[PDB]
Write an enzyme that holds these catalytic residues in place. Structure first.
Site, PDB file in Angstrom:
ATOM      1  N   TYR D  16       0.633  -1.124  -0.118  1.00  0.00           N
ATOM      2  CA  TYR D  16       0.106   0.085   0.465  1.00  0.00           C
ATOM      3  C   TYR D  16       0.893   1.066   0.055  1.00  0.00           C
ATOM      4  CZ  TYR D  16      -4.122  -2.183   0.128  1.00  0.00           C
ATOM      5  OH  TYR D  16      -5.334  -3.101  -0.248  1.00  0.00           O
ATOM      6  N   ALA D  74      10.916   1.779  13.474  1.00  0.00           N
ATOM      7  CA  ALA D  74       9.874   2.076  13.941  1.00  0.00           C
ATOM      8  C   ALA D  74      10.158   1.630  15.191  1.00  0.00           C
ATOM      9  CB  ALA D  74       8.648   1.906  12.907  1.00  0.00           C
ATOM     10  N   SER D 120       1.989   3.033   7.256  1.00  0.00           N
ATOM     11  CA  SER D 120       2.378   2.499   5.839  1.00  0.00           C
ATOM     12  C   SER D 120       3.064   0.892   7.032  1.00  0.00           C
ATOM     13  CB  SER D 120       2.146   2.529   4.733  1.00  0.00           C
ATOM     14  OG  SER D 120       1.617   1.740   3.750  1.00  0.00           O
ATOM     15  N   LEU D 121       2.729   0.889   7.740  1.00  0.00           N
ATOM     16  CA  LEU D 121       3.906  -0.791   8.328  1.00  0.00           C
ATOM     17  C   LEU D 121       3.560  -0.818   9.302  1.00  0.00           C
ATOM     18  CD1 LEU D 121       5.888   0.533  11.301  1.00  0.00           C
ATOM     19  CD2 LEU D 121       6.476   1.556   9.852  1.00  0.00           C
ATOM     20  N   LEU D 170      -2.743   2.762   8.772  1.00  0.00           N
ATOM     21  CA  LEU D 170      -3.603   1.494   7.486  1.00  0.00           C
ATOM     22  C   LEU D 170      -3.643   0.499   8.796  1.00  0.00           C
ATOM     23  CD1 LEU D 170      -1.563   1.497   4.713  1.00  0.00           C
ATOM     24  CD2 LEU D 170      -3.612   2.398   4.520  1.00  0.00           C
ATOM     25  N   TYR D 172      -7.051  -2.713   9.451  1.00  0.00           N
ATOM     26  CA  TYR D 172      -7.799  -4.079   9.039  1.00  0.00           C
ATOM     27  C   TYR D 172      -9.139  -4.031  10.364  1.00  0.00           C
ATOM     28  CZ  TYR D 172      -8.794  -8.299   7.283  1.00  0.00           C
ATOM     29  OH  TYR D 172      -9.401  -9.108   6.454  1.00  0.00           O
ATOM     30  N   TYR D 182      -5.875 -14.127  11.724  1.00  0.00           N
ATOM     31  CA  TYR D 182      -4.740 -12.657  11.757  1.00  0.00           C
ATOM     32  C   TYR D 182      -4.332 -12.946  13.277  1.00  0.00           C
ATOM     33  CZ  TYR D 182      -4.118  -7.310  11.122  1.00  0.00           C
ATOM     34  OH  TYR D 182      -3.834  -6.371  10.501  1.00  0.00           O
ATOM     35  N   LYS D 190      -4.460  -3.513  15.921  1.00  0.00           N
ATOM     36  CA  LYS D 190      -4.924  -2.601  14.912  1.00  0.00           C
ATOM     37  C   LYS D 190      -6.588  -1.725  15.675  1.00  0.00           C
ATOM     38  CE  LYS D 190      -3.070  -3.407  11.091  1.00  0.00           C
ATOM     39  NZ  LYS D 190      -2.289  -2.266  10.583  1.00  0.00           N
ATOM     40  N   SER D 222       0.573  -8.284  -0.689  1.00  0.00           N
ATOM     41  CA  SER D 222       1.199  -7.790  -0.797  1.00  0.00           C
ATOM     42  C   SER D 222       2.684  -8.944  -0.122  1.00  0.00           C
ATOM     43  CB  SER D 222       1.645  -6.192   0.555  1.00  0.00           C
ATOM     44  OG  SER D 222       1.031  -6.886   1.641  1.00  0.00           O
ATOM     45  N   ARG D 223       3.344  -7.969   0.309  1.00  0.00           N
ATOM     46  CA  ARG D 223       5.217  -9.064   1.294  1.00  0.00           C
ATOM     47  C   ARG D 223       4.635  -9.332   1.977  1.00  0.00           C
ATOM     48  NH1 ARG D 223       9.212 -10.287   5.787  1.00  0.00           N
ATOM     49  NH2 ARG D 223       9.219 -12.000   4.764  1.00  0.00           N
TER      50      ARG D 223
HETATM   51  N1  LIG Z   1      -1.745  -6.568   2.576  1.00  0.00           N
HETATM   52  C1  LIG Z   1      -3.316  -6.412   3.463  1.00  0.00           C
HETATM   53  O1  LIG Z   1      -3.604  -6.945   2.638  1.00  0.00           O
HETATM   54  C2  LIG Z   1      -3.655  -4.802   3.572  1.00  0.00           C
HETATM   55  C3  LIG Z   1      -5.201  -5.303   4.118  1.00  0.00           C
HETATM   56  C4  LIG Z   1      -5.594  -4.142   5.389  1.00  0.00           C
HETATM   57  C5  LIG Z   1      -3.976  -3.266   6.159  1.00  0.00           C
HETATM   58  N2  LIG Z   1      -2.979  -3.616   5.459  1.00  0.00           N
HETATM   59  C6  LIG Z   1      -1.946  -2.467   6.728  1.00  0.00           C
HETATM   60  O2  LIG Z   1      -1.279  -1.826   5.767  1.00  0.00           O
HETATM   61  C7  LIG Z   1      -0.322  -1.312   5.948  1.00  0.00           C
HETATM   62  C8  LIG Z   1       0.808  -1.741   4.972  1.00  0.00           C
HETATM   63  O3  LIG Z   1       0.812  -2.825   4.572  1.00  0.00           O
HETATM   64  P1  LIG Z   1       1.441  -4.058   3.205  1.00  0.00           P
HETATM   65  O4  LIG Z   1      -0.068  -4.230   2.992  1.00  0.00           O
HETATM   66  O5  LIG Z   1       1.681  -2.774   1.941  1.00  0.00           O
HETATM   67  O6  LIG Z   1       2.503  -4.932   3.685  1.00  0.00           O
HETATM   68  P2  LIG Z   1       4.026  -4.601   2.931  1.00  0.00           P
HETATM   69  O7  LIG Z   1       4.851  -5.406   3.185  1.00  0.00           O
HETATM   70  O8  LIG Z   1       4.345  -3.622   1.215  1.00  0.00           O
HETATM   71  O9  LIG Z   1       4.703  -2.944   4.497  1.00  0.00           O
HETATM   72  C9  LIG Z   1       5.044  -3.337   5.058  1.00  0.00           C
HETATM   73  C10 LIG Z   1       5.727  -2.665   5.569  1.00  0.00           C
HETATM   74  O10 LIG Z   1       6.042  -2.209   6.505  1.00  0.00           O
HETATM   75  C11 LIG Z   1       7.572  -2.727   7.043  1.00  0.00           C
HETATM   76  N3  LIG Z   1       8.042  -2.746   8.344  1.00  0.00           N
HETATM   77  C12 LIG Z   1       7.546  -3.997   9.094  1.00  0.00           C
HETATM   78  N4  LIG Z   1       8.429  -3.726  10.390  1.00  0.00           N
HETATM   79  C13 LIG Z   1       9.107  -2.917  10.382  1.00  0.00           C
HETATM   80  C14 LIG Z   1       9.671  -1.961  11.269  1.00  0.00           C
HETATM   81  N5  LIG Z   1       9.711  -1.889  12.351  1.00  0.00           N
HETATM   82  N6  LIG Z   1       9.584  -0.664  11.031  1.00  0.00           N
HETATM   83  C15 LIG Z   1       9.742   0.041  10.016  1.00  0.00           C
HETATM   84  N7  LIG Z   1       9.282  -0.660   9.018  1.00  0.00           N
HETATM   85  C16 LIG Z   1       8.562  -1.728   9.299  1.00  0.00           C
HETATM   86  C17 LIG Z   1       8.350  -3.371   6.265  1.00  0.00           C
HETATM   87  O11 LIG Z   1       9.528  -3.051   5.835  1.00  0.00           O
HETATM   88  C18 LIG Z   1       6.930  -3.382   5.027  1.00  0.00           C
HETATM   89  O12 LIG Z   1       7.697  -2.836   3.844  1.00  0.00           O
HETATM   90  C19 LIG Z   1      -0.096  -2.253   7.019  1.00  0.00           C
HETATM   91  O13 LIG Z   1      -0.113  -1.573   8.313  1.00  0.00           O
HETATM   92  C20 LIG Z   1      -1.004  -3.056   7.020  1.00  0.00           C
HETATM   93  O14 LIG Z   1      -1.463  -3.750   8.784  1.00  0.00           O
HETATM   94  C21 LIG Z   1      -2.634  -4.420   4.910  1.00  0.00           C
HETATM   95  O1  LIG Z   2      -2.765  -5.815   8.801  1.00  0.00           O
HETATM   96  C1  LIG Z   2      -2.544  -6.917   7.227  1.00  0.00           C
HETATM   97  C2  LIG Z   2      -4.328  -7.012   6.721  1.00  0.00           C
HETATM   98  C3  LIG Z   2      -4.002  -7.887   5.904  1.00  0.00           C
HETATM   99  C4  LIG Z   2      -4.951  -8.150   5.933  1.00  0.00           C
HETATM  100 CL1  LIG Z   2      -5.636  -9.320   4.237  1.00  0.00          CL
HETATM  101  C5  LIG Z   2      -3.208  -8.473   5.233  1.00  0.00           C
HETATM  102  C6  LIG Z   2      -1.880  -7.729   5.437  1.00  0.00           C
HETATM  103  C7  LIG Z   2      -1.808  -6.897   6.834  1.00  0.00           C
HETATM  104  O2  LIG Z   2      -0.504  -6.455   7.037  1.00  0.00           O
HETATM  105  C8  LIG Z   2       0.721  -7.000   7.534  1.00  0.00           C
HETATM  106  C9  LIG Z   2      -0.060  -8.498   8.128  1.00  0.00           C
HETATM  107  C10 LIG Z   2       1.039  -9.068   8.858  1.00  0.00           C
HETATM  108  C11 LIG Z   2       1.585  -8.313   9.210  1.00  0.00           C
HETATM  109 CL2  LIG Z   2       2.809  -9.492  10.478  1.00  0.00          CL
HETATM  110  C12 LIG Z   2       1.944  -7.005   8.957  1.00  0.00           C
HETATM  111  C13 LIG Z   2       1.143  -6.729   8.027  1.00  0.00           C
HETATM  112 CL3  LIG Z   2       2.180  -5.339   7.535  1.00  0.00          CL
END
Ligand SMILES: NC(=O)c1ccc[n+]([C@@H]2O[C@H](COP(=O)([O-])OP(=O)(O)OC[C@H]3O[C@@H](n4cnc5c(N)ncnc54)[C@H](O)[C@@H]3O)[C@@H](O)[C@H]2O)c1
Ligand SMILES: Oc1cc(CCl)ccc1Oc1ccc(Cl)cc1Cl
Ligand SMILES: NC(=O)c1ccc[n+]([C@@H]2O[C@H](COP(=O)([O-])OP(=O)(O)OC[C@H]3O[C@@H](n4cnc5c(N)ncnc54)[C@H](O)[C@@H]3O)[C@@H](O)[C@H]2O)c1
Ligand SMILES: NC(=O)c1ccc[n+]([C@@H]2O[C@H](COP(=O)([O-])OP(=O)(O)OC[C@H]3O[C@@H](n4cnc5c(N)ncnc54)[C@H](O)[C@@H]3O)[C@@H](O)[C@H]2O)c1
Ligand SMILES: NC(=O)c1ccc[n+]([C@@H]2O[C@H](COP(=O)([O-])OP(=O)(O)OC[C@H]3O[C@@H](n4cnc5c(N)ncnc54)[C@H](O)[C@@H]3O)[C@@H](O)[C@H]2O)c1
Ligand SMILES: Oc1cc(CCl)ccc1Oc1ccc(Cl)cc1Cl
Ligand SMILES: Oc1cc(CCl)ccc1Oc1ccc(Cl)cc1Cl
Ligand SMILES: Oc1cc(CCl)ccc1Oc1ccc(Cl)cc1Cl
Lengths: 289, 288, 289, 288
Positions: D16, D74, D120-121, D170, D172, D182, D190, D222-223
């Site tokens: 994101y 962070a 966004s982490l 961000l 969830y 989760y 969250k 995502s990763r």
């Molecule tokens: N991917 C989904 O389906 C989803 C759904 C809802 C919410 N989110 C939220 O969106 C946000 C972005 O995650 P994403 O889905 O893009 O995956 P992502 O892996 O692209 O983003 C997570 C990033 O956080 C960084 N990170 C982890 N630990 C860290 C630390 N201690 N200090 C600094 N950075 C750190 C990682 O390097 C990674 O690049 C997250 O907070 C996640 O909870 C994601």
């Molecule tokens: O919050 C998240 C919610 C979903 C639901 Cl699709 C997928 C990914 C997410 O992001 C994380 C989930 C777990 C961990 Cl350890 C780190 C991150 Cl960035």
């Protein structure tokens, strides 16, 4: 001594109204049934011919005691609201004192003040149609009978209730989350009922020291639930609930009854304006397993 | 029927723990107190000296039956978790078996399986700072002691509980709406507790048929309440009694009777819920 | 090119409808006003005599462009719903094509398909009475005009809208939390509107790929807001909001307009069924300072 | 107008963070990336090698302008907070000034005051265990890295922000409704973040006139998503695309455009809110 409860909306022994009656009876609360005129006579005859005797058994050493059974139509606030056609309708013509004000008057004259009130009724002409296809008339019908009826019951019964009395109604989670199949503005009516429960909690609490809450119940195969079938809905909901709820047990009407009974008693003195979920926790889930 | 309830978080008779104990006592539930070690000896001393005798009266016939009273620290999951500084503390040095796991084992060894569990405790070393000025250590302390402690209690206590047992904790509406003086990450900890209550409800319900709910109480002038700043608790109480739909004094036993209901079989179809016991204050938007 | 928006509920330049028009105009969206017949002529005359010219100024290098102004009454779904009395009423008798279906037909014939729809209207005969004292007629009036009207607008306008279109309405937090003074079943109607927004999001999203959301706005001293005075309400709400909101700035109708404009544009493609608060954050507070 | 946004939490172009960066870029916002040190060098290497070139195209005329890219952890508030093990780590030893405070100072020293901040982490070392089997250390890690990090970011960044600035994070829907896989206290973290968003909105709004909101996103492959177990993310995406009211693929830039709106002056009257950007999935009760 003399806990008396009026239960508005009982047509048989298969709904939540019966479950609530049974649980209250267990606590020695005297029960008065308000029965909709279209099913009143069939209710009484069944009752008289002993068709409900099994269903009235409690402790196996204890059987439900019913103080009275009264024709009741939550569509009409006062005698003056009854249209000439209804008044002369085959099923209404031999019944009296069935409007909301008249039943309150009747109950009071006969038994004095009461302290427990149950709204256990809903109706919607177009429940089989999705919201988008609901006509204005049908939507207003749903709000009138399912939502406004609670407000009117309150307005007329608060005069015959003691301070520290308690009022409950029944709602469904379709008000908060989308449930396809719950049509005809029923979802809209439940949303209104839940919001009206708060507003009423404020007025009744401040002016009368009376509490009001609503129970958001899980699925029960009642007569009304079966009428949601179109072309079934309730079988799906039951199956889904027993499969995915945190608690995978069959939801019983007396499960709702024992919560109702708690909320009606003095034990819930500090609870008002609330929507309380009695649904084996289904409401807390997002995605199934 | 021989019901037993462990109540974790009693320090005197002015808090919600005591009220819950009293109401359960009416139902003939056997009560076991988990008492925070720093106040354990003072509590036992007040109890021995009869200070609580009047507070223990259930009515004309009945006195509160207290089965046992044990030191309990929710900071520690197991014996391994206590640090040397605590090991060495005046108040702790003379006590033992007060970690979460040790207390579960001790209760189970003395009295067998229980069927009711109450979490009525919180702590936050930076409660008097606003969230923005709370340190990482302070925030995590609030979460550790006020939220994680519920998870750990469940993890260790399920082994010693009967099927169809019931668990409750206490929360506050600051998790959902902003309350300016509720600092130190206490609002965060309560938000986490309410969400944790749901997730736990899923796990405990499917795996053990055990229920868990949380009671969101209105203000009570307890020991801990007197620690918060705007006094905060005096303001909260006056506001509640002025604006709540029910204009009556909120009593600890008002929470107690709801707890007793949630802990009985009467509420078998309720789980994972936040139940408001606050004279309806939470429903108001604009003070009138 | 040819973003066209119908805004239902504009009577002057003092409400949210005007603020929404102004912000949309800034993005070059063509505006069509739906004006309630009781105030239509006074609206047009004011407009013609240049009374709104100041209010139509945007960039100081830019002025609002209004594509059309149409009589509109959200009480009536189709020509066949209009009672003989209304049809012959002094203010209606010289107006045509003002029902929901007729305006949709008219708009389509004149301009083709549209892609943006705004419900910015509410009404309640008994708004001055507390919920408990609201009559059945008054409560149904509130639901009919404030809530059902959204459903009907959707049913008739989805035929004249392109896929990926967007629909917004306006709500108030009294649906969720008790606001004394917001009477007549207005609270109940907003609760219904918010719940109907979800249900409609489901139907419109699946069958048409159309989105619908609602904005829960903070207090604005509009003409309707002043009519809540009894025996004022809006002055209290404004003063309370400017004093206790996280953001202590005056809430402007164009603050709502720019959110509306975002939700109507393709930028909000993944948002539907939501109640979005535009109220300087007041909704998040429990106790004042 | 010379807007600058710090985006904390970019590791590649599949999350994101990248989507938010792209959409802001359309508005000519200058972008600064905060990159987690363990993946900083690999990121710089992919960037130098042109791996991201196609992902950076905004359209016919425009390429993403990236002002700077800095290591950011962070886990650490200040220089004092890093332990010897991290100090000594292969990946960290060759970097510096990557604590929260150091990054605020570094940005302010290089570019001056900023007006947009994106969190966004998340991280949780026990994400693969269910809440009930999560350890105290694991739970507090999730809260430390996923929730407290937002507070700390705000605390240090406000000094370098303009009045009327805007902040987003961000979240969830697992905070509000149970999502079985989760785990590790991510649901708890969250829940705390969404509540913290409110409390922060009060403090930042009254004291600095700064807004803060949180976007509750639907699933994106995502990763980090690929780290969760039921694969979890593959199930979530299929379920969302089958049952959401809008049956369309959720894109990172769908979150990006909402973020861009929340970070602009357009949303001046919105603060303390959880905004759902999930194709409406959150409104459903019963799958149809
Ligand atoms: N991917 C989904 O389906 C989803 C759904 C809802 C919410 N989110 C939220 O969106 C946000 C972005 O995650 P994403 O889905 O893009 O995956 P992502 O892996 O692209 O983003 C997570 C990033 O956080 C960084 N990170 C982890 N630990 C860290 C630390 N201690 N200090 C600094 N950075 C750190 C990682 O390097 C990674 O690049 C997250 O907070 C996640 O909870 C994601
Ligand atoms: O919050 C998240 C919610 C979903 C639901 Cl699709 C997928 C990914 C997410 O992001 C994380 C989930 C777990 C961990 Cl350890 C780190 C991150 Cl960035
Ligand atoms: N059954 C379920 O699964 C379920 C789930 C949630 C909520 N509820 C709610 O519980 C309540 C009772 O429904 P039920 O499921 O027990 O079905 P039910 O048929 O047992 O109850 C409905 C009763 O209301 C009566 N009634 C209808 N219109 C009336 C009027 N105008 N005046 C007086 N009485 C009238 C009918 O005679 C009927 O006996 C309803 O409010 C319903 O919305 C039911
Ligand atoms: N008092 C109120 O107004 C109010 C309002 C809402 C919720 N609550 C909640 O009710 C619960 C009970 O608190 P109270 O108001 O009765 O105050 P209280 O002081 O009576 O109860 C708190 C107890 O927790 C114990 N405790 C603190 N840290 C502990 C640890 N690490 N391990 C074990 N025990 C520890 C203390 O000894 C104390 O006895 C709390 O969780 C509180 O958040 C209180
Ligand atoms: N003003 C506030 O403080 C406030 C706060 C929250 C929500 N709202 C909502 O915003 C919306 C607009 O209200 P406002 O505050 O801008 O006042 P307003 O008077 O500017 O808007 C109301 C308009 O709706 C029109 N209308 C009434 N009945 C109609 C019908 N049957 N058909 C067509 N039009 C009709 C009226 O002519 C009037 O112009 C309403 O839905 C209201 O509930 C207002
Ligand atoms: O509210 C209800 C919710 C469910 C979900 Cl299981 C099932 C039945 C219900 O009750 C009614 C539903 C529709 C109508 Cl017209 C009347 C009634 Cl009493
Ligand atoms: O949660 C509480 C909420 C209120 C609002 Cl009236 C009052 C007291 C509370 O309990 C605590 C508050 C802070 C701390 Cl450090 C510990 C505890 Cl037991
Ligand atoms: O919804 C409203 C909420 C507020 C809170 Cl400030 C003020 C005005 C409102 O709009 C109306 C209120 C009542 C009626 Cl009868 C019509 C309308 Cl348009």
């Amino acid at each position: 001594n003399e806990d008396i409860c009026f239960i508005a909306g009982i047509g048989d022994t298969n709904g939540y109204g019966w479950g609530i009656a049974k649980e209250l009876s267990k606590r020695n609360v005297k029960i008065i049934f308000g029965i909709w005129p279209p099913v009143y006579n069939i209710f009484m005859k069944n009752y008289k011919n002993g068709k409900f005797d099994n269903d009235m058994i409690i402790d196996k050493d204890k059987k439900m005691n019913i103080l009275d059974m009264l024709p009741f139509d939550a569509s009409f606030d006062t005698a003056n609201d009854i249209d000439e056609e209804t008044k002369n309708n085959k099923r209404y013509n031999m019944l009296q004192n069935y409007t909301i004000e008249d039943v309150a008057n009747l109950i009071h004259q006969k038994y004095g003040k009461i302290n427990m009130l149950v709204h256990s009724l809903a109706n919607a002409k177009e429940v089989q149609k999705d919201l988008l296809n609901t006509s204005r008339k049908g939507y207003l019908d749903a709000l009138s009978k399912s939502s406004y009826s609670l407000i009117s019951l309150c307005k007329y019964f608060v005069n015959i209730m003691k301070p520290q009395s308690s009022i409950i109604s029944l709602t469904y989670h379709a008000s908060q989350k989308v449930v396809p199949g719950y049509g005809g503005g029923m979802s809209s009516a439940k949303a209104a009922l839940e919001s009206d429960t708060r507003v009423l909690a404020y007025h009744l609490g401040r002016n009368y020291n009376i509490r009001i809450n609503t129970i958001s119940a899980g699925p029960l195969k009642s007569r009304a639930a079966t009428a949601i079938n179109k072309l079934t809905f309730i079988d799906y909901a039951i199956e889904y609930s027993e499969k995915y709820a945190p608690l995978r047990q069959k939801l019983l009407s007396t499960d709702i009854g024992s919560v109702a009974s708690f909320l009606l008693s003095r034990e819930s003195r500090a609870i008002t304006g609330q929507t309380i979920y009695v649904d084996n926790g289904l409401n807390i889930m997002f995605l199934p397993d």
